[PDB]
Write a protein that binds this ligand. Structure first.
Ligand SMILES: NC(=O)C1=CN([C@@H]2O[C@H](COP(=O)(O)OP(=O)(O)OC[C@H]3O[C@@H](n4cnc5c(N)ncnc54)[C@H](O)[C@@H]3O)[C@@H](O)[C@H]2O)C=CC1
Ligand SMILES: NC(=O)C1=CN([C@@H]2O[C@H](COP(=O)(O)OP(=O)(O)OC[C@H]3O[C@@H](n4cnc5c(N)ncnc54)[C@H](O)[C@@H]3O)[C@@H](O)[C@H]2O)C=CC1
Lengths: 219, 223
């Protein structure tokens, strides 16, 4: 299908794979409100994105994805300034073992908050029409990385919550879709297009690796 | 190796599976510092416990596993009383989806904090002697529960952190072992305390996930 017209919210996209994601969506005809607190990097990201895209299809917001109030405000501003929402990308994350409290409050808590907000603003039952919510993870959620325990715990929690809430939505008949991405950056953003362009792929985990390009792991 | 004369600390033993754990230890002679938050369910457990075992082999300290200032003081007083520490058991848990913050703060954060405190108090690198640390998870950490996503998050996080910290301490040459056990839907509650002892028995196992199912009995996760 054509992703044109749709509205998307990608979290933490001022630099890196996050930013990459936006490009694809912007080049696919959608309109993206990048969300990240890296204002110095986010403004430059929007500037770079503009040169090949009309400036009304790129917005930016500043909110660290750790507080429910700020995340809710960001979602409200997205759906207001654009009128709706169809695509959610929860990818903001930090790699750190020392202050593992933050490592666990960022990767796992904020993904759940974002998915609940996406269900709220997209669940057929309570308005809207649905769409898709994708959470970004890594092999640490599927492999034990002895080097970084808390990282492995966060990724495992994400890859559990994704399936749980996908089953919940599928039982509630709410339109919202949930999927999880666990790769080994343009090839990474080539996964959003692969997943979003098929409504028969919900509540699953996909892997991007050098062995098989893009594929899906079967439980 | 030997279980007699050791010292163990099980969190949340005022009732249920927790209690089973404690009792089994006193069958094998290990001295135990019970910990839980429901003091009402704890004092009765203590009274029923010292009946079959000498008064001086057990103690109880009431605290929540999520308050760091309390989980440090519990370990400190336990070491002060028994003079050592060898076995740690993180069993505190709750099912709740309304205040979904607390499910994670309890099932996941408290386990990690207790494990780190135990490693500090047991690792050969800092004047300890060694022992074992054990964490309680469930099949929720290995299969999706429809209505309880935060519970799955906590269980999965515990599985990962155990399997990682075990190897982290193993390669450092610390001596301590870390493992996590998962029971079935409770299945005789004794069957879980019949498992805890097993972990303290064997010494060639580190970071093993034990699963209980009523079709084959007891097995371990495959990776
Ligand atoms: N580490 C890796 O190599 C892999 C990572 N991923 C996913 O990609 C994410 C990052 O990938 P990278 O390309 O390495 O980018 P990165 O981690 O270097 O980029 C982080 C960007 O997001 C922002 N950010 C991070 N956490 C945030 C938070 N809690 N609140 C607000 N802004 C936040 C940072 O300011 C920065 O703008 C990881 O979190 C994970 O989701 C996926 C597979 C492998
Ligand atoms: N609930 C069940 O029947 C089953 C439990 N499990 C696993 O076994 C663990 C123990 O469950 P049960 O013994 O059946 O529970 P229970 O319903 O018999 O009692 C819960 C125990 O946890 C303690 N506890 C709860 N939150 C605590 C906290 N924040 N700090 C300290 N202690 C706390 C309570 O004091 C009580 O001792 C569960 O956490 C779960 O990991 C798995 C399968 C079935």
């Amino acid at each position: 299908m054509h992703v044109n017209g749709k509205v998307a919210l990608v979290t933490g996209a001022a630099q890196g794979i996050g930013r990459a994601f936006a490009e694809a969506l912007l080049l696919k005809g959608a309109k993206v409100a990048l969300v990240d607190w890296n204002l110095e990097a986010g403004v430059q990201c929007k500037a770079a994105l503009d040169e090949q895209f009309e400036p009304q299809k790129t917005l930016f917001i500043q909110c660290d994805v750790a507080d429910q109030q700020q995340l809710r405000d960001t979602f409200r501003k997205v759906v207001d300034h654009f009128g709706r929402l169809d695509i959610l990308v929860n990818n903001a994350g930090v790699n750190n073992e020392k202050n593992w409290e933050k490592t666990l409050q960022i990767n796992l808590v904020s993904v759940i908050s974002g998915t609940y907000l996406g269900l709220d603003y997209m669940s057929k039952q309570n308005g809207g029409e649905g769409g898709i919510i994708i959470n970004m993870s890594s092999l640490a959620g599927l492999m034990p990385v002895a080097q970084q325990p808390v990282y492995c715990a966060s990724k495992h929690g994400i890859v559990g919550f994704t399936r749980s809430a996908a089953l919940a939505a599928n039982l509630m008949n709410s339109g919202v879709r949930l999927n999880a991405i666990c790769p080994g950056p343009p090839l990474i953003a080539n996964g959003l297009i692969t997943l979003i362009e098929d409504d028969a792929l919900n509540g699953a985990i996909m892997k991007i690796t050098t062995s098989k390009g893009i594929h899906f792991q079967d439980y």
